[PDB]
Design an enzyme around this catalytic site. Structure first.
Site, short mmCIF file in Angstrom:
data_model
loop_
_atom_site.label_atom_id
_atom_site.label_comp_id
_atom_site.label_asym_id
_atom_site.label_seq_id
_atom_site.Cartn_x
_atom_site.Cartn_y
_atom_site.Cartn_z
N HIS A 89 3.22 11.70 4.88
CA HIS A 89 2.47 11.67 6.13
C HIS A 89 3.34 11.19 7.30
CE1 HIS A 89 -1.68 11.24 3.96
NE2 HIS A 89 -1.19 12.46 3.91
N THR B 213 -6.91 5.44 5.38
CA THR B 213 -6.95 4.04 4.97
C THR B 213 -7.80 3.35 6.02
OG1 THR B 213 -4.97 3.64 6.32
CG2 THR B 213 -4.66 3.89 3.92
N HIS C 191 0.83 -1.20 0.00
CA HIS C 191 0.00 0.00 0.00
C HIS C 191 0.87 1.25 0.00
CE1 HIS C 191 -3.27 -2.55 2.19
NE2 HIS C 191 -3.34 -2.70 0.87
ZN LIG Z 1 -0.92 8.42 4.75
#
Ligand SMILES: [Zn+2]
Ligand SMILES: *[C@@H]1O[C@H](CO)[C@@H](O[C@@H]2O[C@H](CO)[C@@H](O)[C@H](O)[C@H]2NC(C)=O)[C@H](O)[C@H]1NC(C)=O
Ligand SMILES: [Cl-]
Length: 259
Positions: free
Chosen positions: A116, A199, A65
């Site tokens: 992030h 997510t 991911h």
């Molecule tokens: Zn993220």
């Protein structure tokens, strides 16, 4: 049981298997500078020694991911309502050939990639997982990434080792580098707002901070990150690209800005 970004189990179906994903305060969001409420009382987001990651190798792995770097508990984020501790860091990018890979938008404009930095309230809770579902439990830093004309050395500390973790689940260690250098040079300008994880499970515990200034990486650097990792454990591989969630409904939320 394995969610993906696009497809039969894409972000479009997350609400089905993860109810929280259809919450009222989801992220990311399209920040409209006209609607931004100026808040002169917002203290500066100050990363305490994010240039000192100690001596121990940092863990850099593949989720299928995204590429995620691990961070020591010695990294402390100040300037927020509670005291937060850095835990991890990862990226989001668009597919090969695209220059739109970020999750957050600014007046409907997306950049090439987004960084992030996930933190957790270690002052009110024991661990990151404990805070993952607590109001204001997590605190993330969003750095938008544009394509500049010069090579960014700060990012090579991660792009130069992507071939070691090509396939999903592979990991490795990297010499500790200055993460502070991955953030834009000036941190005065930023937008704050209550969001969620981007997510599944999509917990609404994140107190977001999206910087206004951007970080730049060469077009060459962007290609490496875009065409190196796979989302599978073994071959046949499948480009790990398009790993960004689309802007979500603001649902009457106030987006504050330091400037
Ligand atoms: Zn993220
Ligand atoms: C995120 O949500 C929290 C809670 O809804 C906001 O904090 C509230 O702020 C008001 C005044 O600003 C206080 O009177 C409330 O007591 C606060 N709630 C609690 C229980 O802490 C916070 O402002 C939001 N964050 C931003 C900047 O959007
Ligand atoms: Cl399955």
């Amino acid at each position: 049981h394995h969610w993906t970004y696009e497809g039969p189990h894409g972000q479009d179906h997350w609400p089905t298997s993860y109810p929280e994903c259809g919450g009222d305060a989801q992220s990311p969001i399209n920040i409209q500078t006209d609607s931004v409420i100026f808040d002169p009382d917002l203290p500066a987001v100050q990363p305490h020694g994010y240039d000192q990651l100690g001596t121990e190798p940092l863990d850099l792995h593949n989720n299928g991911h995204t590429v995620q770097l691990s961070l020591p508990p010695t990294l402390h984020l100040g300037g927020l309502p509670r005291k937060y501790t850095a835990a991890q860091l990862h990226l989001h990018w668009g597919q090969r050939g695209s220059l739109e890979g970020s999750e957050h938008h600014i007046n409907s404009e997306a950049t090439a990639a987004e960084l992030h930095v996930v933190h957790y309230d270690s002052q009110s809770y024991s661990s990151l997982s404990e805070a993952a579902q607590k109001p204001q439990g997590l605190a993330v830093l969003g750095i938008l990434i544009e394509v500049g004309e010069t090579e960014n050395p700060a990012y090579d500390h991660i792009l130069s080792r992507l071939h070691e973790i090509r396939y999903k689940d592979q990991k490795t260690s990297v010499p500790p580098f200055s993460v502070r250098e991955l953030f834009p040079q000036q941190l005065e300008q930023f937008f704050r707002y209550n969001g969620s994880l981007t997510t599944p499970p999509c917990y609404q515990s994140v107190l977001w901070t999206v910087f206004n200034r951007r970080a730049q990486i060469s077009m060459g650097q962007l290609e490496k990150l875009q065409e190196t990792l796979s989302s599978t454990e073994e071959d046949p591989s499948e480009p790990l690209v398009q790993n960004y969630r689309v802007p979500q409904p603001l649902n009457q939320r106030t987006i504050f800005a330091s400037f």
